[PDB]
Ligand binder design. Structure first.
Ligand code: FAD
Length: 378
């Protein structure tokens, strides 16, 4: 009957809620955003249209609800390797070897909404429009303060036995913990910026691709260039979500004129005009929201009395593409629930061991992602 407040309803917070729901906790899930499932919610906070979910990501979901997981991952698209497109438009297929991990394309909106639908079926209370503003820590029940609704009111308070921060890279929960526990902490803002482009489905079925795909759906497509990159991952309807990645200065330098963007696109990626509308590409490029990307590390991840813990981007936000934040966050949840099961529900011991065993793995995954990016960008 122990109570837990889970701060943040992104991918990792929903998975965590589903996790704790099923173990028999009374879960309340909070997020300052409105419900993304609602027609009236205009900003769905989707950092990307699709994602590469790996074997670890998949397993973690499977270990929490195999029956729903089957239907949740129904329309994912398995990848067999990477397809490299050189400057001349030549394509080379590079299949996934004995060091590389296999991945699947899945739609972000569909995953996150489907998790919310499983939560709706569970005992979990969903509280949208609730912004965590403060935690009062005690040796029994932590006091959470929220503000509600626009000119944010005051959801008075509620008390919970413990708190899980899944509140993203800018975690309010994390700051509150820092006032209670000496936390080693770093934040590094990357030079990276990304822009989403669109490759439409073909008009006709393409028998050799098994759908209306302009290029091969079973490859992650990559156009590697000097300090920048284009990628494309298939969507269910035959389209591809394409993403351009480079330094902010390069991008800021390009978007000063539409013809400069266009010529840049034609000169690099010449095989893209056969499958993409250049004018729509130029407009997307110039107007796609500029988003800061921060990388963080924490130690420890927990407040000592088993009172709180940080999972997902709140704990270890990393470089996109070179790192896999969602997969790592899913793995976070799987690892924590096994530790709770192992210690018969003893939070104090479980959270403590999580920090002792997880930190070294995460320092490594996140440093490797930083290093792989650093090398590309220099
Ligand atoms: C372009 C791009 C591509 C990516 N591709 C992949 C990929 O292919 N594979 C992969 O594994 N990862 C990928 N990632 C990383 C992945 O998107 C993230 O790691 C993952 O979505 C983070 O999940 P989260 O639940 O921890 O955080 P978030 O998605 O940030 O969710 C946090 C939630 O907390 C809420 N919140 C914040 N503050 C408060 C507050 N004070 N009170 C209440 N709620 C609050 C926010 O509203 C938000 O909804 C990609 C990232 C980017 C940017």
């Amino acid at each position: 009957s122990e109570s837990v407040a889970i701060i943040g309803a992104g991918l990792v917070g929903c998975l965590a809620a589903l996790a704790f729901s099923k173990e028999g906790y009374n879960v309340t899930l909070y997020d300052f955003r409105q419900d993304p499932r609602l027609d009236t919610t205009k900003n769905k906070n989707l950092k990307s249209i699709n994602l590469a979910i790996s074997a670890r990501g998949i397993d973690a979901l499977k270990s929490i609800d195999p029956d729903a997981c089957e239907h949740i991952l129904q329309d994912m698209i398995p990848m067999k390797g990477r397809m490299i497109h050189d400057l001349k438009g030549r394509q080379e297929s590079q299949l996934y070897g004995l060091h590389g991990e296999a991945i699947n394309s899945i739609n972000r909106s569909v995953l996150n909404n489907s998790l919310l639908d499983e939560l709706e079926k569970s005992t979990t209370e969903l509280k949208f429009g609730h912004k965590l503003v403060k935690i009062e820590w005690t040796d029994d029940k932590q006091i959470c303060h929220f503000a509600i609704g626009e000119d944010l009111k005051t959801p008075h308070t509620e008390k919970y036995d413990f708190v899980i921060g899944c509140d993203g890279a800018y975690s309010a929960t994390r700051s509150q913990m820092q006032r209670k526990v000496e936390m080693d902490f770093s934040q590094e803002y990357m030079n990276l910026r990304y822009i989403e482009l669109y490759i439409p489905p073909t008009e006709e079925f393409k028998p050799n691709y098994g759908g209306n795909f302009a290029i091969a759906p079973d490859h992650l497509h990559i156009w590697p260039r000097h300090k920048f990159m284009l990628i494309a991952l298939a969507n269910s309807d035959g389209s591809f979500t394409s993403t351009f990645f480079g330094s902010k200065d390069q991008i800021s330098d390009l978007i000063t004129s539409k013809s400069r963007v266009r010529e840049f696109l034609i000169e690099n990626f010449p095989d893209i005009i056969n499958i993409m509308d250049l004018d729509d590409a130029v407009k997307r490029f110039i107007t796609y929201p500029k988003e800061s990307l921060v990388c963080v590390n924490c130690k420890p991840y927990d407040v000592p009395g088993g009172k709180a813990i940080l999972l997902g981007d709140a704990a270890h936000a990393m470089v996109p593409f070179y790192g896999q934040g969602m997969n790592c966050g899913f793995e976070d949840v799987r690892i924590l629930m096994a530790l709770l099961k192992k210690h018969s529900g003893d939070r104090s011991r479980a959270f403590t061991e999580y920090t002792q065993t997880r930190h070294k793995d995460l320092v490594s995954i996140t440093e490797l992602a930083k290093r792989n990016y650093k090398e590309m960008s220099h």
